[PDB]
Symmetry: C4
Subunit: 121 residues, 4 copies
């Protein structure tokens, strides 16, 4: 993953009970672009947390998973009013959680959810 | 909030277990317009209650929240057959309940749900 | 109700836990028309039961309810590929169950669900 | 069923708690075509399993059921971007599980879900 330094695992981080794309948010620097606010609720938590991920960051995850896993183990990835990416990335995440455990709980997926730089509110 | 005198808080009013937009209803005075019937179920209640809110009243809530909260903490607000406002206001409410607790349980949101003038069946 | 002789009440019949429109089915006599197969699961039952209702029969129910109840207490009623009536009648039923108890459990609604002539498989 | 040798029954195989179409997957031999990855969770299982079924294989199931069962006991069957078959086959499966028990738990349905040749990962 080209956006997280360390690699993390659901061991240290906590399993995911709920995820979704909560909203999308407009940026400025370094160029105009939408970023997706991802809502995560872990096991044992009542307050959700939120991380920030661009479309090109969702895509990288799916491309990296697809190196490790046969495609049939992965949900379809989708190819502004084009906040249909919000709905589509949401489906993508929901399906990801319903994939066999070797995918849903692998270290890439965990790392994708680990709070970064930006995510420190 | 330009439509409720007092300000209320989930302290005195009771936490929300379920909300949605139940239907929309056609008015007359002082001018033709649709009003949204919002269905609320509190904790400890089995019978829901219903309040009446216009689109311009949902909008004010979102604008007032957006003064207090960074935008990324809030769900997207949407810009008759145009009862797509019903579906859209419904999503908006569902997302609002899934926002971090400092938004979902703030006094504005509580006040928006407090029964007014009209709401006394 | 112009299609059930007696009037029935959730007293004698059993409360509804689940309803939906399950499929729609093509008829012949006395003229070509679609009829809706409504799936009902009562409290205390594990096997659902099924009754048969035409669109004009859903409509009558809504019109009769609207004599008794102010409109804001009722879900919107919708104005073949036109099996969007299935999706729409389904929403209508789901909302009906979420209406205040004086509507959701009134004798008209109960009677609408009581097995008729046709419904004896 | 023209694609499973033996016939199986939920007796030996285990009842279904969750099914859905998880993704669709592109094939090559013997000709270009999409195949549907069906996600099944049995009672007593936490890890789902996955079988592979073409559209013409879903259709055969529905046609064979329709020999045994009156049509009103069956959900509507639907008549690439045409991965609307995924959404549509998914609805079809969800409805199938909600059909009366004599359909939802018959040996054809069970057999449709029994892991074949291909399904051995």
């Amino acid at each position: 993953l080209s956006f997280s330094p360390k690699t993390y695992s659901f061991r240290q981080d906590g399993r995911i009970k709920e995820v979704s794309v909560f909203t999308y948010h407009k940026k400025y620097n370094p160029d105009k672009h939408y970023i997706y606010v991802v809502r995560i609720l872990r096991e044992g938590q009542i307050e959700p947390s939120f991380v920030f991920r661009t479309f090109d960051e969702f895509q990288e995850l799916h491309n990296k998973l697809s190196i490790i896993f046969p495609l049939w183990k992965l949900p379809g990835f989708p190819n502004d009013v084009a906040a249909k990416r919000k709905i589509e990335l949401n489906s993508y995440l929901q399906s990801l959680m319903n994939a066999s455990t070797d995918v849903a709980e692998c270290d890439l997926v965990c790392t994708f959810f680990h709070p970064l730089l930006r995510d420190e509110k």
